[PDB]
Amino acid sequence: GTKKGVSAAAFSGVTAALGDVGARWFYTWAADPQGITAPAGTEFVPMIWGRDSVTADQLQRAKAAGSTLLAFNEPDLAGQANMSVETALDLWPQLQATGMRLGAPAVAYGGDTPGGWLDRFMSGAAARGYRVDFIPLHWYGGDFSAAATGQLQSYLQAVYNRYHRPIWLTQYALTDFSGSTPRYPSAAEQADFVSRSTAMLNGLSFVERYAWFSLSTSTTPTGLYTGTTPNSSGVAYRAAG
Numbered sequence: 001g002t003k004k005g006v007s008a009a010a011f012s013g014v015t016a017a018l019g020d021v022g023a024r025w026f027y028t029w030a031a032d033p034q035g036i037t038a039p040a041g042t043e044f045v046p047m048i049w050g051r052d053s054v055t056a057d058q059l060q061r062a063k064a065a066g067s068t069l070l071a072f073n074e075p076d077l078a079g080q081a082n083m084s085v086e087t088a089l090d091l092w093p094q095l096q097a098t099g100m101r102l103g104a105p106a107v108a109y110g111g112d113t114p115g116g117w118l119d120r121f122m123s124g125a126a127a128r129g130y131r132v133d134f135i136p137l138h139w140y141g142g143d144f145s146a147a148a149t150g151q152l153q154s155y156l157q158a159v160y161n162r163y164h165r166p167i168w169l170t171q172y173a174l175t176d177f178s179g180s181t182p183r184y185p186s187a188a189e190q191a192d193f194v195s196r197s198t199a200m201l202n203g204l205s206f207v208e209r210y211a212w213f214s215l216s217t218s219t220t221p222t223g224l225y226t227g228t229t230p231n232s233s234g235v236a237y238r239a240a241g
């Protein structure tokens with residue numbers, strides 16, 4: 001339906017790639033499309049990335065560029081938004097005051113863990129009477145087998161069962177970051193996971209939207225397209241619902 005989206009950046013060919021792959025929505029990790037011209041039928045979803053992203057200007061730009069707002073990117077990691085739950089909660093009224101459908105900050109991991117970043121954020125928000133409309137998640141699988149899709153499914157289910165909010169999957173791929181250098185699947189393994197994972201996600205009623213990381217090989221080695229040419233993963237993503 002309207003689930004299948006992507007993360008994107010303004011490479012030459014971006015408008016053509018977005019249209020080619022059938023992306024119904026996209027985001028850029030910023031408050032506006034960052035120089036991307038969307039094709040017809042493709043919705044831009046703004047993001048407030050971190051603490052210093054929360055300004056009158058970014059929030060006004062966000063509301064002009066879209067109608068759904070993603071909050072901070074991986075506050076739980078020192079290399080990303082690097083924000084305590086309490087700082088996220090104290091900033092939340094400024095995002096909530098936009099009136100837009102509002103995503104939780106996207107935690108890198110452990111969204112189902114009692115006492116973890118999300119769990120303390122959701123508990124604090126409930127106690128303050130704040131609105132959290134949906135939960136975006138991130139997941140990178142280290143097992144490159146046919147078992148990967150069921151592992152992804154179990155994490156999304158776990159988060160759904162804990163908070164009972166609709167789920168978005170805003171960054172996902174196969175990548176192992178457990179070693180000193182990232183480890184990536186073979187092309188065939190990655191295309192097979194694209195096919196199985198999208199079929200699962202399309203059938204899971206509490207998943208609203210999903211976004212493969214990422215549209216371009218200029219962003220990441222798990223990219224779907226190089227310029228306007230899909231690889232076997234882009235072809236599989238194109239063929240997904």
Ligand SMILES: OC[C@H]1O[C@@H](O[C@@H]2[C@@H](O)[C@H](O[C@@H]3[C@@H](O)[C@H](O[C@@H]4[C@@H](O)[C@H](O[C@@H]5[C@@H](O)[C@H](O[C@@H]6[C@@H](O)[C@H](O)O[C@H](CO)[C@H]6O)O[C@H](CO)[C@H]5O)O[C@H](CO)[C@H]4O)O[C@H](CO)[C@H]3O)O[C@H](CO)[C@H]2O)[C@H](O)[C@@H](O)[C@@H]1O
Pocket residue numbers: 028029030034049050051052053073074080108109138139140141171177219
């Ligand atoms: O607005 C003012 C503000 O602007 C910012 O600029 C924006 C810029 O920050 C943004 O950058 C994008 C970037 O966020 C994004 O990063 C991804 C990253 O999320 C990904 O992280 C992974 C984790 O996901 C992974 O988690 C693991 C998990 O899956 C597994 O299940 O469990 C593990 C258990 O712990 C777990 O760790 O862990 C690894 C290893 O640590 C992380 O690497 O990593 C990818 C790959 O490197 C990284 O790409 O990437 C986007 C694409 O590059 C960037 O775009 O981009 C915006 C638009 O350009 C900018 O506006 C400034 O940075 C702030 O300073 C400003 O104040």
